[PDB]
Symmetry: C2
């Protein structure tokens, strides 16, 4: 029973699969579906923006990770943990994480490997919920996230 992990995995998996397939998973949202939806919109705008402002960096990182199969998607946990846990915990870091997640998912759809898009998301979630939990709790979670990127 980890609501934070549940909603996080929902939003993240939805965004990473939507960024790849190009289609919107119109399936009904779970609990706090309003927050999840708004979070998905925020991630759409801000996330795509980040993917456009850091194309070179994401491309080079993807080239360096060399993700060709599911075992690689399993192994990238350590490096992800190392690079992400820079100690500096800001929402821009999170959005960067999920956006590169989406980039990687796109590549994983380019290569015949949509089968790896779902576990990847989990890994991402598994990091964000473990490394920066108490922080996320203190920032009112996704409710803060949305409220942070309001224009």
């Amino acid at each position: 029973s980890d609501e934070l992990y549940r909603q996080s995995l929902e939003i993240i998996s939805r965004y990473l699969r939507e960024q790849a397939t190009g289609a919107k998973d119109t399936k009904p949202m779970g609990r706090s579906g309003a927050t999840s939806r708004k979070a998905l919109e925020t991630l759409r705008r801000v996330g795509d923006g980040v993917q456009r402002n850091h194309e070179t960096a994401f491309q080079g990182m993807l080239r360096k990770l060399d993700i060709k199969n599911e075992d690689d998607v399993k192994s990238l946990s350590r490096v992800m943990i190392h690079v992400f846990s820079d100690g500096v915990t800001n929402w821009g870091r999170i959005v960067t994480l999920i956006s590169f997640g989406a980039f990687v998912a796109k590549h994983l759809k380019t290569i015949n490997q949509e089968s790896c898009i779902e576990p990847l998301a989990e890994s991402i979630t598994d990091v964000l919920v473990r490394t920066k939990r108490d922080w996320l709790v203190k920032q009112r979670g996704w409710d803060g996230f949305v409220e942070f990127f309001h224009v």
Copy 2:
């Protein structure tokens, strides 16, 4: 970070340790150590009781080796999800984990810590919100007061 995971891991690992070796880790606890110590004392009491009452079933469960310590995860998750979510089941998990730790303290101490990490992982993941409720280990000690 995850203070719940940290404190839980400390308490669990230290109980499994003290039970497996007989010695104590005199090194002071981390944050909210006042609660962690009492949690360890409580765990000593009711936990040793639980073991001393469920020895047989415990002896049966271990029948089904550093390569399998990362494998007990699944069956532990399944069996833990079985039954109602009460403090007694958590105490059961920790006590049994302590006995399993004893087994490793006899057949070979190298596999105790990853076991503690597994226990803590299952507990704090499956019963996260229930544990952030009950004020955590504070409520754990409040449950078995006196």
